[PDB]
Structures are given as C-alpha cells and as structure tokens.
UniProtKB/Swiss-Prot annotation:
The modification N-acetylserine is found at residue 2. Induction: By hypoxia. The chain crosses the membrane at residues 26-46, 60-80. It is a multi-pass membrane protein. Its main location: mitochondrion. Residues 1-93 form the HIG1 domain. It comes from Homo sapiens (Human). The modification Phosphoserine is found at residue 8. Keywords: Acetylation, Electron transport, Membrane, Mitochondrion, Mitochondrion inner membrane, Phosphoprotein, Respiratory chain, Stress response, Transmembrane, Transmembrane helix, Transport. This is HIG1 domain family member 1A, mitochondrial. Gene3D superfamilies: 6.10.140.1320. Associates with cytochrome c oxidase (COX, complex IV); proposed complex component. Also associates with respiratory chain supercomplexes. Proposed subunit of cytochrome c oxidase (COX, complex IV), which is the terminal component of the mitochondrial respiratory chain that catalyzes the reduction of oxygen to water. May play a role in the assembly of respiratory supercomplexes.
Length: 93
C-alpha cells in the first residue's frame, strides 16, 4: 500500500526522479541490504572526514562501526514493522 509518493520531497536535488526509480521492482530486500549496506559504508566512510558536508554528532555514539550496528538495528526493527505491523518475514518449514 502506497498513496504518498511523487510530489513529496522538500529538497531541490534530483535528476530524472523516474529514472532514479527505474530499477528492479521494489519489494526484495536483497538489494536493500546489499546496496543499502554498501551505501551506508560509504556514508560512514565519508562521515569520518569532518570537512565534507556533514553534521553528525549527537548522543554517546562516538563511533562508526558501532553506531552502524545500532543504526542498522533500529532501521531493521523499524523497517520490519514498516510503520504498520506486517506479519510476513519468511514462513520456513
């Protein structure tokens, strides 16, 4: 279920949104974890450097990897619940 999507992004920065959306039919997390993880790594990597458009410093998380674990964690639970409870993960045998 998705109703809010399209004209909703207060930030002038996007080259051919549709194109940016042009990819494997969103659904599988395989690319989410793969890509996501990769990106994250990048972000953090860059985050390290002070000078380079960045302003991340709050709480007792004076770390990267660690902060990464806690982040991915909250993101995991949050994602899993996707805001609204959704019983569906992997009904294995």
């Amino acid at each position: 279920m998705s109703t809010d999507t399209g004209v909703s992004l207060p930030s002038y920065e996007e080259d051919q949104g549709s194109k940016l959306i042009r990819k494997a039919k969103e659904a599988p997390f395989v690319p989410v974890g793969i890509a996501g993880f990769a990106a994250i790594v990048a972000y953090g990597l860059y985050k390290l450097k002070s000078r380079g458009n960045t302003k991340m410093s709050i709480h007792l998380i004076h770390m990267r990897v660690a902060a990464q674990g806690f982040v991915v964690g909250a993101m995991t639970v949050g994602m899993g619940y996707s805001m609204y409870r959704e019983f569906w993960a992997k009904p294995k045998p």
